[PDB]
Amino acid sequence: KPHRYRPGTVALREIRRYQKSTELLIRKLPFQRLVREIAQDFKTDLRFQSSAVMALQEASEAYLVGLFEDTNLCAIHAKRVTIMPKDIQLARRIRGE
Template structure:
């Protein structure tokens, strides 16, 4: 409700109008900028879409699968790709959280590459990725 609508409106009756039948006159309704949102706002707990796009993920998964299976091409279910995507996102988010804690420990708020390297070293991920 906008501030314009908060004041009570006194109806105009037959006593003050030249028309003989009693009725209530209302001003025409109009929309003013800033009265309300144009779209419903989202609650903070709403589910957000996936961070990684699934389209480029499928060819990469297929390429890595071909490298490890010596040329045998396997089919992937959509649910398997979604599960792989969720796991990859969770891994990256957790790694970035640890790296940010490393930057806070160094009394900085900017995330540097050395923070990511330290987080990977503390997690024991030096050899792999």
């Protein structure tokens, strides 16, 4: 009885909304904690400027978006609509990683 959208309308709406914006989609403090933890292995007592974590987040988000674009192309090639780890691995293999 309550109104309900079909499975895929909200997905397209979100696609348009997040292709309209320019914000950062990852959480700032969790990303900073991840960066600090990774830096711990390479060297201890390292300090990060607040701009360094921002630049890292920018580069990471851009890389992930491009990877997802190639992954979607592979999934469409496979006569699918859903992306899968197979698509991610194929994209990485073709791009040379």
